[PDB]
Every structure is written in C-alpha cells, then in structure tokens.
Amino acid sequence: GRGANMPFTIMEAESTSNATNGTKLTPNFKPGDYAGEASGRSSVYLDATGEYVEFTLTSPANAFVLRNAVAENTTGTVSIYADGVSKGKFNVSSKFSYLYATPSTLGRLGYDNAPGAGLTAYWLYEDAQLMLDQVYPAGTKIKIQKDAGDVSWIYVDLLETENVAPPQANPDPTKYVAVSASKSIDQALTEFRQDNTKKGIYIPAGEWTINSKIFLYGRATEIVGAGPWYTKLVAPQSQSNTDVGFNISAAANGSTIRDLSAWGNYINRVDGPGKFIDGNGMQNVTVQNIWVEHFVCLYWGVNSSYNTFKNNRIKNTFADGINMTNGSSYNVIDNNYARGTGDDSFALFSATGSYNVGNKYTNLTATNVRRAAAFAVYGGSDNLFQNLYGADTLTYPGITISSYSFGYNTLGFGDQDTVIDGATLDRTGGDFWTSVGADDKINEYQNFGAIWIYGGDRAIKNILIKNVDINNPVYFGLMFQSMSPNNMVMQNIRVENVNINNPSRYGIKLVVRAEQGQGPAYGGASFTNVKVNNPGISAIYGEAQSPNFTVTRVSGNNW
Ligand SMILES: [Ca+2]
C-alpha cells in the first residue's frame, strides 16, 4: 500500500484539490488542538451557513464516514450533497469525544470524560457514518455543507468513501441458526450447541443489542453477519462502559466471527473489562471483516496462538487495538485498519513458554493514534512486521521497539530477528513523560522519534529495520536509547534502505541524557542506504557523546 488494502478511500478535507469557503487550519503537532489532532494535522472549519468543503470521488461510493469535531456534549447534523443536490444528513456527535487531563497528567488520557476545574480537553474528533441510496461514480462532487438547522460549527477532517455491496443473506438457514426479532443471539447459540448439524449462527442486517458477554463453547462456532455496514451489534447506548461482546472458551477454539460491526458504549478507558472479544489462550480462531468502535480494545491475547485477525476495522477505542501477549505465537494479524486507538494500535508484548514467536503483523494501517504508538513490539523472537502505514501519533513513536519489562517476567528480545520490513510513517512521534535534568532539552517532556529503539532492563538484540520511509516526523526519524544503569548492550541492530525526510530536529538521535540519572546508549547499530533529507538542525545528534555506542556506516548514507 503501504498498509492495509481496504475498500474505503480516505480523503483529507484540507486537500488543495477540494474547493472550500471555510477555514483551513494551519498544521501543528499539538494534542488537545483541532489541527494537532486531525488526520494530516489539518481540517476545514465550517462556521457559517453555506460554508462547505467539496470532495471529488476517486472511486465509486454509496457510503461515507465523516471524521469531524463538534462542540462538547452536543449532537446535530451536517449536510451531504452530490453534484450540488442535497442527499442527506450526517448524524454528528461528541458523545464519545473530549477526554480530559492536564499537560502534566497525560498518563490520564482516555480515562476521564468529564470536564472539570483545571482540566484540558483532548481526543476531540469523532466519526459519523452514512449510507446513501445510490452508488455515485468516481468524479462525483461530494460536498459537506453547513445548512440552516445544522450544527453551529464543525471541523471536517477527512471523508471515507466506500462502495458497499448489498447485504449478504444467511449462507444456509439449515446450517446457521438465524438471530431474529424474537430469537436472541444467546438463544440461537443454544440451538446451535444442541444440534450438531449446525455450523453456527447468522446475525441479519439490523441493530441488535449486546448487553452481555456472549460465551462460545461446546465446539468451534461460526458467527456470520450480513457485512459490517449492515449487521450492527450495539451496546446499550443509554448506558456507558458496559463490558459486552464475545468470550471464547477453549471448547470453541477454531471459531470464526465475521462480517459484522460492533458499536460499544465506552466513554473512557477501563483496565480489564472492555475488550470486544475475550479469548484467553484461544487457538485457531478467525476474526475477519468486522468493524468495532468504542470498546477498550478489539482483542488482548494472553498465550493465544495460531489465530487470524484479517480485514478488520478498529476505530475510536480507549486502549490498544490488538495486543498479543504472554506467549502468543504464530498469529496472523493481516490487512487490518486502525484509526483513533487509545493506546498502542497493534502491539506484541512478549513475556514468559519463553517468547512470543512466529507472529506475522502484515499489511497494517494505524493512524490518529490518540496515545502511545502506531506499532509496538516489546521483546519476542522471530516476529515479522511487514508493509505498515502509521501516521499522526499524538504522544509517542510510529514504531516502539522496546526491551523494557514493565515489571513483568520477560527475557526481552530473543535469538531470532524481530523484523520491520516496509513501512511508511507520516508525522509520527510526540511528547510524553518528563525531562527533568535532560540533555537536548526543548520542553518539559521527553521527545519521541518516528522509530524508538529502547534498550530497557532486558536483552535488546536481533532487530532488523528495512525499507522504511519516515516523512515529516515530529522530531526525529530514528531514536536510540539505553536505560541506565542496566546499560544493556544492543546487538545485531541493523537499519537498511530508510529515508528520513524533513525531521524538525535530527534524522537520527542517540539519546545522551533523557532525564536526571540517565546516560547514553550501549552497543551499536549498522546503517545501509539511510538518507537524511533536510533536517531542521543536523542529520545525527549524540554520536560524539555516546562513546559506547558504535554507529556503523556500511554504505549509502548521506550523513
Ligand atoms: Ca485532515
């Protein structure tokens, strides 16, 4: 792509291709800011009746997602036009946006949705979904316009456009027990469990309350919807933070959940509950073509292996999108799109079995990461991250590569490579933690590059980063750092075929003193065909001050 191959096209409102009589925001990298938090770091602000932004379709579309910001605690409309003719109203809302913290308490991002004395609002954008009764061809002018009776003001960030096929029917009513207006999901599963001729259940187009965690057991179960635009599992929207979804017991290893959406009711992060799918230790489970929003996570695996997560959309969550932890091995995390996660969008956390091994995170997109990284790998061995697109992180790298234990029982990285191969990272990095007594001090925070290679308290070894384009990172392209006093020696760290374009500070930073008590990096890294283009200050910082870190310029470096 790079990244996931999705049927929807992402179009930025602020494109110079888009006529507008509204106000185009100049970009910045600030959390809590309507530009800093926008995709592309810009949006078009509509603030008077008749103000519009005009998109042009580049593929046919009958369905649309409008990423937007409106006033806190409000709902209303904004209008959609096709070739100058009005066609409907988006239902725009800040029900799930505006999370409160302070600049010195960004660890609270996502945890508190209530305004309060001294608190600043963050996580300002949210989405409106709308299907129209016609497929419009490429070249159609799709105008978002503020008409009389629409909201007082709205920031228009981007538009998804998609040509959604008609809903798919029950594949076979004699094999898939249908959920219906008078037969619940649980009742259909009971009929399935008790009749061995059934393969699973079918959930038709419609809105279906999920007010519980739905347990899958007995045997491998198929759960099949009509398509994610059509089958909507809905947490009770007059409640908040209800732990609902599926929980897959061991007897239902080998299950498949596909072709549906799930609309949670979380308005803040909670730690433990809130994953749409629970499945601790699950094996051979497939989760495919589902669209989930407003949960804490889609899935947080614990010693979960041989699973497949494919073609999913994970948007506007309060922590990670998908994390696989504590022994999770041989998983296929392929062709998934995440936008607006509340912690690491796609993560792998290795802990003691010894390592998470053999995982393949491929063709992944993670954008508008509202806290932490687009992609994060914490230890492990023989894991592949391939064809990634990451962009617009609020607080942290595009890719975190870290051997910090976080206090858990882990050995760090193992004896086979952790590979990042093929990645584009646009406007990644950000501010987090504090930098009291730091070298190279530019503000009150620590400052994170597009890729952070962090040796923590465990082994940091066998890391291959290749075929990466880093465009306009907030601060740096590559940032290497060793935790003191552990000073783990970085070994077999190699960087190949990397372009670092317009970093505001440095192409490469070797962190010399992150904060009081910390020192420079230990070990070294090799660089082959790594280009640093137009750095704000200099191509590399920290090399002379890092006498125990060896930069090896193999060939092809312009620095
Ligand atoms: Ca935008």
Side-chain angles (χ1 to χ4, degrees):
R2 294 205 169 103
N5 175 18
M6 287 284 135
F8 50 89
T9 299
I10 302 275
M11 296 203 296
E12 297 290 353
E14 64 272 18
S15 171
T16 58
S17 281
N18 292 349
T20 185
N21 62 355
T23 300
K24 188 172 303 189
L25 303 185
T26 300
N28 62 60
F29 294 128
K30 292 202 291 195
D33 187 276
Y34 290 108
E37 291 199 7
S39 181
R41 309 298 179 144
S42 177
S43 59
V44 180
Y45 175 65
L46 311 180
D47 191 34
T49 298
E51 284 187 8
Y52 66 86
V53 47
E54 183 180 74
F55 300 83
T56 305
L57 294 184
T58 55
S59 309
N62 55 6
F64 304 91
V65 180
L66 186 76
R67 190 175 200 252
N68 71 87
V70 295
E72 204 261 350
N73 194 37
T74 68
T75 71
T77 53
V78 70
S79 303
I80 182 167
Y81 287 67
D83 293 333
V85 177
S86 64
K87 294 298 179 183
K89 305 283 199 181
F90 285 95
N91 186 341
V92 296
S93 182
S94 53
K95 176 182 177 90
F96 292 102
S97 50
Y98 291 79
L99 281 293
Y100 290 86
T102 74
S104 68
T105 59
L106 299 180
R108 296 304 291 169
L109 280 175
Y111 282 96
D112 182 11
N113 75 115
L119 299 183
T120 296
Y122 301 87
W123 296 19
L124 310 170
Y125 283 91
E126 251 290 335
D127 296 353
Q129 302 76 31
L130 182 68
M131 176 170 282
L132 297 184
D133 72 356
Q134 186 188 322
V135 179
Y136 293 92
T140 301
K141 298 302 201 215
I142 295 293
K143 178 169 57 155
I144 305 305
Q145 179 163 296
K146 212 176 83 64
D147 286 339
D150 289 340
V151 293
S152 290
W153 55 262
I154 180 166
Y155 294 84
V156 179
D157 181 10
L158 62 80
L159 184 72
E160 301 181 20
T161 75
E162 190 177 346
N163 184 10
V164 187
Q168 87 181 339
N170 191 332
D172 188 335
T174 70
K175 298 180 188 175
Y176 299 85
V177 183
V179 173
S180 78
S182 65
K183 187 181 294 181
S184 69
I185 293 166
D186 278 339
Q187 290 172 320
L189 284 165
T190 293
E191 181 175 338
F192 152 81
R193 283 192 318 273
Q194 294 174 2
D195 182 350
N196 58 9
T197 69
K198 306 297 179 205
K199 293 202 269 177
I201 69 170
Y202 172 73
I203 310 181
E207 299 186 19
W208 309 96
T209 291
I210 48 173
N211 58 17
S212 71
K213 267 280 159 73
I214 299 158
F215 281 84
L216 308 192
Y217 56 103
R219 64 187 186 275
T221 306
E222 296 182 39
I223 302 192
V224 181
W229 273 93
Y230 299 115
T231 295
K232 301 168 181 189
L233 311 185
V234 184
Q237 292 294 301
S238 54
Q239 303 166 7
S240 59
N241 299 350
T242 71
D243 185 20
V244 305
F246 293 99
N247 187 323
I248 308 178
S249 303
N253 283 347
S255 297
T256 298
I257 301 176
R258 61 178 170 100
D259 303 337
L260 55 80
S261 53
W263 294 92
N265 64 6
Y266 279 88
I267 63 179
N268 62 261
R269 176 170 179 166
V270 300
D271 295 323
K275 293 110 183 178
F276 171 61
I277 294 163
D278 297 309
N280 292 327
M282 81 185 190
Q283 317 276 307
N284 300 300
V285 169
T286 295
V287 177
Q288 181 156 349
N289 189 34
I290 73 165
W291 170 1
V292 297
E293 309 209 6
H294 307 137
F295 289 87
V296 182
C297 311
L298 169 56
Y299 184 71
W300 185 291
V302 180
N303 203 9
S304 300
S305 296
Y306 300 99
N307 304 294
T308 295
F309 284 76
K310 182 181 183 180
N311 297 342
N312 303 301
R313 322 173 186 202
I314 308 161
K315 291 188 258 172
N316 311 312
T317 65
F318 289 85
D320 295 41
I322 297 174
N323 194 2
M324 304 298 269
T325 81
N326 298 10
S328 296
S329 299
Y330 302 108
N331 294 288
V332 170
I333 310 299
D334 178 48
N335 208 62
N336 302 290
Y337 173 95
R339 181 175 74 228
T341 67
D343 209 307
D344 292 326
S345 297
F346 298 97
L348 190 61
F349 188 95
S350 190
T352 72
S354 267
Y355 303 91
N356 301 13
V357 305
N359 296 285
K360 294 179 158 61
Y361 283 50
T362 58
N363 307 305
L364 301 183
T365 292
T367 61
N368 289 121
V369 191
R370 304 195 281 185
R371 175 218 182 124
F375 306 94
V377 55
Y378 304 96
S381 185
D382 185 37
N383 294 301
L384 172 68
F385 300 78
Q386 186 174 62
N387 190 30
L388 316 176
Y389 181 73
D392 292 316
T393 50
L394 289 190
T395 71
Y396 218 45
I399 306 177
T400 292
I401 300 169
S402 163
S403 72
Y404 185 48
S405 72
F406 295 83
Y408 300 100
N409 186 356
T410 159
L411 301 185
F413 289 95
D415 285 358
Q416 290 179 14
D417 279 339
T418 299
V419 180
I420 285 70
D421 174 20
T424 299
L425 304 170
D426 291 350
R427 300 169 307 276
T428 64
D431 295 327
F432 211 70
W433 306 116
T434 54
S435 59
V436 178
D439 171 72
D440 192 42
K441 207 189 164 60
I442 59 186
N443 57 36
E444 85 199 69
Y445 302 102
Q446 288 173 44
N447 314 121
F448 290 88
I451 303 183
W452 182 33
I453 307 91
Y454 182 51
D457 52 351
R458 300 296 179 256
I460 167 71
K461 51 175 165 182
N462 300 311
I463 306 298
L464 173 63
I465 298 158
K466 58 178 174 178
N467 303 311
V468 179
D469 294 311
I470 291 159
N471 298 309
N472 312 316
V474 179
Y475 295 125
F476 333 106
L478 311 172
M479 177 171 145
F480 298 81
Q481 176 184 353
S482 296
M483 174 180 177
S484 300
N486 311 66
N487 297 344
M488 307 299 289
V489 173
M490 299 194 187
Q491 297 185 313
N492 295 344
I493 317 292
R494 306 93 75 196
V495 185
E496 311 170 345
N497 303 332
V498 173
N499 298 306
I500 300 163
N501 301 308
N502 316 304
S504 82
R505 304 277 293 178
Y506 316 112
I508 298 165
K509 179 169 172 176
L510 313 180
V511 179
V512 174
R513 182 172 74 256
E515 55 186 354
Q516 189 270 162
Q518 293 297 305
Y522 280 79
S526 72
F527 301 80
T528 307
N529 197 25
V530 176
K531 298 300 201 296
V532 178
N533 301 311
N534 191 39
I537 303 177
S538 68
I540 176 166
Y541 177 85
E543 190 175 8
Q545 297 172 88
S546 307
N548 292 315
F549 190 89
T550 297
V551 174
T552 296
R553 297 159 168 82
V554 178
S555 57
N557 307 296
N558 69 335
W559 51 273

